[PDB]
Design a protein around this motif. Structure first.
Motif, PDB file in Angstrom:
ATOM      1  N   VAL B  33       0.851  -1.187   0.000  1.00  0.00           N
ATOM      2  CA  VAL B  33       0.000   0.000   0.000  1.00  0.00           C
ATOM      3  C   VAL B  33       0.887   1.236   0.000  1.00  0.00           C
ATOM      4  CG1 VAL B  33      -1.853  -1.212   1.209  1.00  0.00           C
ATOM      5  CG2 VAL B  33      -0.200   0.187   2.529  1.00  0.00           C
ATOM      6  N   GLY B  35       0.621   5.379   0.421  1.00  0.00           N
ATOM      7  CA  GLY B  35      -0.092   6.606   0.722  1.00  0.00           C
ATOM      8  C   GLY B  35       0.670   7.467   1.708  1.00  0.00           C
ATOM      9  N   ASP B  36       0.434   8.773   1.655  1.00  0.00           N
ATOM     10  CA  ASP B  36       1.078   9.707   2.572  1.00  0.00           C
ATOM     11  C   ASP B  36       0.586   9.478   3.999  1.00  0.00           C
ATOM     12  OD1 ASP B  36      -1.376  10.479   1.511  1.00  0.00           O
ATOM     13  OD2 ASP B  36      -1.071  12.595   2.007  1.00  0.00           O
ATOM     14  N   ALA B  45      10.519   7.974   6.482  1.00  0.00           N
ATOM     15  CA  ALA B  45       9.906   8.985   5.624  1.00  0.00           C
ATOM     16  C   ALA B  45      10.832  10.182   5.436  1.00  0.00           C
ATOM     17  CB  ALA B  45       8.575   9.439   6.205  1.00  0.00           C
ATOM     18  N   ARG B  56       6.253  -4.030   7.211  1.00  0.00           N
ATOM     19  CA  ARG B  56       5.696  -5.371   7.064  1.00  0.00           C
ATOM     20  C   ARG B  56       4.362  -5.538   7.778  1.00  0.00           C
ATOM     21  NH1 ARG B  56       8.225  -9.892   5.559  1.00  0.00           N
ATOM     22  NH2 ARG B  56       9.931  -9.558   4.065  1.00  0.00           N
ATOM     23  N   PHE B  99      -5.807   8.956  18.209  1.00  0.00           N
ATOM     24  CA  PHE B  99      -6.668  10.014  17.688  1.00  0.00           C
ATOM     25  C   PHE B  99      -8.007  10.061  18.418  1.00  0.00           C
ATOM     26  CE2 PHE B  99      -4.077   8.191  14.293  1.00  0.00           C
ATOM     27  CZ  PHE B  99      -3.309   9.285  13.948  1.00  0.00           C
ATOM     28  N   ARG B 100      -8.198   9.135  19.353  1.00  0.00           N
ATOM     29  CA  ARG B 100      -9.423   9.074  20.136  1.00  0.00           C
ATOM     30  C   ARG B 100      -9.505  10.275  21.080  1.00  0.00           C
ATOM     31  NH1 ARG B 100     -12.018   4.556  18.274  1.00  0.00           N
ATOM     32  NH2 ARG B 100     -10.299   3.252  19.048  1.00  0.00           N
ATOM     33  N   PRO B 101     -10.554  11.108  20.946  1.00  0.00           N
ATOM     34  CA  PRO B 101     -10.693  12.250  21.858  1.00  0.00           C
ATOM     35  C   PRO B 101     -10.761  11.808  23.319  1.00  0.00           C
ATOM     36  CG  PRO B 101     -12.156  12.497  19.986  1.00  0.00           C
ATOM     37  CD  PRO B 101     -11.604  11.107  19.914  1.00  0.00           C
ATOM     38  N   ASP B 102      -9.612  11.402  23.846  1.00  0.00           N
ATOM     39  CA  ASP B 102      -9.508  10.862  25.194  1.00  0.00           C
ATOM     40  C   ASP B 102      -8.045  10.590  25.482  1.00  0.00           C
ATOM     41  OD1 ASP B 102     -10.430   9.322  27.706  1.00  0.00           O
ATOM     42  OD2 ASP B 102      -9.385   7.768  26.563  1.00  0.00           O
ATOM     43  N   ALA B 105      -6.326  13.929  25.613  1.00  0.00           N
ATOM     44  CA  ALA B 105      -6.332  14.640  26.888  1.00  0.00           C
ATOM     45  C   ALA B 105      -5.338  14.025  27.870  1.00  0.00           C
ATOM     46  CB  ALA B 105      -7.729  14.640  27.481  1.00  0.00           C
ATOM     47  N   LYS B 106      -4.972  12.769  27.629  1.00  0.00           N
ATOM     48  CA  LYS B 106      -4.003  12.069  28.467  1.00  0.00           C
ATOM     49  C   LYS B 106      -2.579  12.409  28.041  1.00  0.00           C
ATOM     50  CE  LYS B 106      -2.719   7.401  30.024  1.00  0.00           C
ATOM     51  NZ  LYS B 106      -2.802   7.783  31.461  1.00  0.00           N
ATOM     52  N   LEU B 115      -8.111  17.492  33.609  1.00  0.00           N
ATOM     53  CA  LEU B 115      -8.501  16.112  33.852  1.00  0.00           C
ATOM     54  C   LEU B 115      -8.013  15.656  35.219  1.00  0.00           C
ATOM     55  CD1 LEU B 115     -10.052  14.378  31.692  1.00  0.00           C
ATOM     56  CD2 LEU B 115      -9.063  16.522  30.899  1.00  0.00           C
ATOM     57  N   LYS B 118     -10.592  16.679  37.792  1.00  0.00           N
ATOM     58  CA  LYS B 118     -11.795  15.858  37.705  1.00  0.00           C
ATOM     59  C   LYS B 118     -11.631  14.534  38.441  1.00  0.00           C
ATOM     60  CE  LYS B 118     -15.050  16.709  34.965  1.00  0.00           C
ATOM     61  NZ  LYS B 118     -15.107  15.219  34.998  1.00  0.00           N
ATOM     62  N   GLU B 119     -10.393  14.194  38.780  1.00  0.00           N
ATOM     63  CA  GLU B 119     -10.121  13.006  39.573  1.00  0.00           C
ATOM     64  C   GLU B 119     -10.247  13.330  41.054  1.00  0.00           C
ATOM     65  OE1 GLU B 119      -7.098  10.402  36.727  1.00  0.00           O
ATOM     66  OE2 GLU B 119      -6.298  11.540  38.425  1.00  0.00           O
ATOM     67  N   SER B 123     -14.353  13.882  42.964  1.00  0.00           N
ATOM     68  CA  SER B 123     -14.376  12.772  43.910  1.00  0.00           C
ATOM     69  C   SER B 123     -14.701  13.250  45.324  1.00  0.00           C
ATOM     70  CB  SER B 123     -13.032  12.040  43.902  1.00  0.00           C
ATOM     71  OG  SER B 123     -11.984  12.891  44.331  1.00  0.00           O
TER      72      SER B 123
END
Lengths: 378, 134, 252, 127
Positions: B33, B35-36, B45, B56, B99-102, B105-106, B115, B118-119, B123
């Motif tokens: 495959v 692709g950029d 790269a 591989r 890329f998960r919006p989570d 934040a970590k 964040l 929020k812990e 609590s």
């Protein structure tokens, strides 16, 4: 761009192309090397006179390395800014007659184009982030699941159909062994379970079809003639299927029936995938007996005794149990040449199991079939 | 020994030599495959095209990625911490779930500050203390 | 292989700790040897097993050269292997050298092995118009045959020396010399390469004849056609759709 | 083909918006090229395929010249096509030129194609 510059600089000297030297003479040509099979262009190609060379070059490689180069085409091809608005075009057959595609029609006539296979439509590869739909998997204490995104009409991540196309060729190899199993619903391309999308604007979660464009029936066909691979969807079913798998090679027409049929099978990508797998047999296996004493009658043995297990006439129940056998029948007439004593020159010819492609039908009330009920004598 | 043992009257030898043509293991149907991916940000790269060792994906797209140093130092609007300077997202991709919006934040140091509260802040046991019962 | 502790450790003594001992190399400069060795070391092999020199070419037949001294090293990655051969010849290199009159020692990538595809002398191959002449020059350049034809000279000037004084004729020398070589000429092919490489030649003529003046002297003239080896082939695949007209023909 | 946005758009750059770019022509004055090219470019074709030069005449045989650069334009109607050839030779023109010692490059109306029926030198034919 790093390939645009490559082919455009070495179009008339492909053997010196850097990429060509990382697929042909590198792994396919060399001894211990493992050859490639079916490259996958993750790009989108327009009607530009630059991107046309990109295919002309990559196909120049694929043609020799024997590796059908599959890719996708941008909505800029049909001269429209929204791919969904391709449905408005009546027949693309009459479209390509427009002088805007002159450069393109020339490329479809090239031999290398019989290895390019361009796909239309883009599947949705990610569902946008809602709390009630596709919630971000937060942490074991950091409340994050309550988290929205921002989209509406049509602009939230896409991916080219070419993926599923190749991802079916892989499937059509682990299960079967050749590439008959990549077309139609019952046979190949079905592509189960796609990433659809749902949203609550004001109604009650109005679903969004996973595919970019909802091709109709005659679209499936009216694209196959242009040399494109449509990724058509079943409305609501959240699925797809590849009906057509044609290369960009021109289909022609011709007067002589045989000639007309030739061009119909050559344009068909699924066969050139298979015929390619024979090249990966010759320039791969017969290399072992490169020094052994062999004859015209011995090479016709080794090469035939192999392919013989993949040729039949009888049909097996179910598609899969029969797609084991791609070819119908094969000839293999090798023959030594004068001058060079240890050299030969083969010439095979394969007729693949011709796939279904459509049919007309005229129904009628004859009332002449059973004259015992409508005849005079009674 | 090439000198060879002196022959007796009843020399038995037992042949253990076997000739034949070696076997060949099947070829995995390779799929290239192109692709950029890195947009010009990876070990293979950043190098010239004349020398780019193809990957591989023996393991998976999770580890073949981490094998490439895909980082990025792109600017972004700031809504956390004090002082000027736009927020500078700067961390290398390990898995595909980055890329998960989570996982973002970590990774981004600035966002992690909110964040972190929020812990601790969330609590607050205003249910154990409020639930007094004599 | 250069000396590392984890790789190719120096066999120390029964008390003198020495196995912990490194060397100093990196790119490409740590002892080499010419391919000619394995080439000859296969001609020897192609003699104890078979008897002539057909068994020194190709993979399945002769030159395979199993198990070579590769090399491995840990610079920063995880023991990146180093191919045993100096140069990783591609396919058309194997051929484009054979024409120059060279013997390439090509390697199989990773397999840590090799093979001699070509075994040509430095003799020019020529081309010529007449087909026969063109084929002559193709076989003469081929080293493996001149190795065999040479073994006949080692038969004549070696064995016939015994009957140097015996009374013999034109019809008697054609007997002794032919009755021998006859056991090494065939047309039929045997299964496997080895079982057939016993027979180098295809057919032979031996027309000796006395000369005037010298009564006890003669003048032979043999001619051998060796079993021509495989060397390559082109191939054109095509979808005919004319082979089985029963499916594409007009009449239906 | 002259440059229109909806027809034959200039291939702009990956950010520099340029595709929206027109030209200025109307009747008959926007670049031409002599038929001699396709004539020779068929002699070449009539050599790689065959080996001699019989394959440069007629439709079924030689000169067909497939896929020419036509032109379309929207003045007021609906994209009225413009024949690729300079002149639309009739039938007896194909012949009445062959006698003068000329090679007419006749077009098939609408088909956006051509063909060389006559391939005569300038030599007099006599009688």
């Amino acid at each position: 761009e790093e390939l645009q510059y490559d082919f455009e600089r070495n179009l008339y000297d492909i053997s010196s192309s850097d990429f060509f030297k990382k697929v042909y003479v590198s792994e396919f040509d060399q001894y211990g090397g493992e050859p490639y099979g079916a490259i996958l262009g993750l790009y989108n190609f327009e009607n530009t006179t630059n991107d046309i060379i990109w295919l002309t070059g990559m196909g120049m490689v694929a043609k020799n390395s024997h590796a059908p180069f599959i890719a996708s085409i941008d909505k800029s091809f049909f001269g429209v800014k929204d791919l969904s608005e391709i449905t408005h075009i009546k027949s693309f057959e009459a479209l390509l007659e427009h002088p805007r595609y002159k450069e393109w029609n020339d490329f479809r006539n090239l031999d290398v184009a019989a290895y390019i296979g361009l796909t239309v439509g883009d599947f949705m590869l990610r569902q946008p982030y809602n709390p009630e739909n596709n919630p971000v998997q937060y942490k074991l204490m950091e409340g994050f699941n309550e988290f929205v995104d921002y989209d509406k009409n049509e602009s939230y991540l896409w991916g080219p159909a070419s993926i599923h196309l190749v991802k079916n060729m892989m499937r059509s190899y682990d299960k079967t062994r050749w590439f008959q199993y990549i077309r139609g619903v019952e046979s190949g391309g079905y592509v189960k379970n796609l990433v659809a999308c749902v949203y609550d604007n004001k109604g009650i979660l109005e679903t969004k079809s996973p595919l970019n464009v909802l091709f109709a029936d005659y679209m499936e066909l009216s694209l196959a003639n242009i040399g494109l691979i449509p990724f058509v969807s079943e409305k609501g079913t959240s699925n797809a299927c590849f009906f057509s798998v044609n290369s960009a090679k021109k289909v022609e027409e011709f007067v002589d029936g045989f000639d007309s049929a030739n061009s119909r099978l050559i344009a068909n990508l699924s066969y050139t995938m298979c015929i390619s797998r024979i090249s990966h047999y010759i320039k791969c296996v017969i290399r072992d007996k490169i020094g052994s004493i062999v004859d015209v009658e011995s090479i016709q043995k080794i090469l035939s005794d192999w392919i013989s297990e993949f040729v039949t006439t009888v049909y097996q129940p179910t598609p899969l149990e029969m797609a084991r056998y791609p070819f119908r029948n094969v000839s293999i007439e090798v023959k030594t040449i004068p001058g060079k004593p240890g050299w030969y020159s083969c010439k095979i010819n394969v007729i693949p199991h011709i796939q279904f492609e459509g049919m007309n039908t005229t129904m009628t009330i004859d009332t002449r079939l059973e004259p015992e009920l409508f005849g005079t004598n009674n | 020994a090439k000198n060879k043992i002196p022959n007796s009257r009843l020399m038995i030898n037992y042949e253990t030599n076997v000739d034949g043509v070696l076997k060949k293991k099947e070829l995995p149907y390779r799929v290239l495959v192109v692709g950029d991916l890195s947009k010009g940000r990876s070990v293979d790269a950043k190098k010239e095209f004349a020398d780019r060792e193809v990957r591989r994906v023996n393991n998976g797209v999770d580890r073949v990625l981490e094998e490439m140093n895909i980082s990025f130092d792109f600017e972004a609007p700031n809504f956390v911490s004090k002082d000027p300077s736009n927020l500078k997202v700067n961390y290398r991709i390990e898995s595909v779930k980055d890329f998960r919006p989570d996982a973002v934040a970590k990774k981004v140091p600035e966002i992690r500050a909110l964040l972190e509260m929020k812990e601790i802040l969330a609590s607050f046991a205003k249910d154990i203390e409020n639930n007094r019962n004599l």
